[PDB]
Amino acid sequence: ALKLEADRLFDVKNEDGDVIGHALAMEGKVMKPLHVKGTIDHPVLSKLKFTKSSAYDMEFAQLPVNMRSEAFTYTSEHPEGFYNWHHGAVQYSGGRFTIPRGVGGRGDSGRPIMDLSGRVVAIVLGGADEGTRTALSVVTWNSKGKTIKTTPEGTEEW
Secondary structure, X not given: OOOOOOOOEEEEEOXXXXXXXXXXXXXXXXXXXXXXXXXXXXXXXXXXXXXXXXXXXXXXXXXXXXXXXXXXXXXXXXXXXXXXXXXXXXXXXXXXXXXXXXXXOOOOOOOEEEOOOOOEEEEEEEEEEEOOEEEEEEEEEXXXXXXXXXXXXXXXXX
């Protein structure tokens, strides 16, 4: 098994070039958390006209006809249990996505949480530590395509 995947996850860098977040190609668009102020490290994507959505901390542009194929697929059905992401396992219970304490931080905004069939279930924005875990502030869409944002008490944007 070789992890040969399309180009869908992109870095957003700050003025001196530090990775401060992530952008993703999904459902025909390139989206990135609005709070992440930097540039998408991509010669084509960085020149697109992005549309702001402050109510959801989202910013998006339309995928160039070509790249439209190189993208993730979303899914609004997330039964409780475990999910995957860059750092390992993400748990979903009580309507909340949690990871262990001390794992999330700067650079993790824009990162997707996915299921075993490789579909995106959510996009990470920040986290609020509660006891031995961290409750994630994520963006998700429902069955009727409505964007939804969940933000725990005391959430700190990553």
